[PDB]
Structure 1
Amino acid sequence: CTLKSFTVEKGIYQTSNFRVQPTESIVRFPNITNLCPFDEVFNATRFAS
């Protein structure tokens, strides 16, 4: 099926790659460390007028 026929002659033939290999997905990123100061504005004792 890589020569696209049903009869092949004597000799050596250089075929292709038709086998299918399953794959996964992965992702990596640095360490989240420097958070924003949301507590000071959302958890303040007194809010301005």
Structure 2
Amino acid sequence: VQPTESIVRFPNITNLCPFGEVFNATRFASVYAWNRKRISNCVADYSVL
């Protein structure tokens, strides 16, 4: 019997990346004083970008 389709499963998405705050910051950093943080242990939803 041949496999009739392919099924793919993973846990639910959770804990999105802080990009959602970064690109909504009205206080966005001046280039003479640029600022950063490590996005880690997160769902990097780059498809939304």
**TM tier, shorter chain?**
0.3 to 0.5
Structure 2 length-normalised TM: 0.45
Higher relative contact order (CA 8 A, sep 6+): 2
Mark the structure with the bigger radius of gyration: 1
- Greater percentage in helix: 2
TM-score, structure 1 length as denominator? 0.45
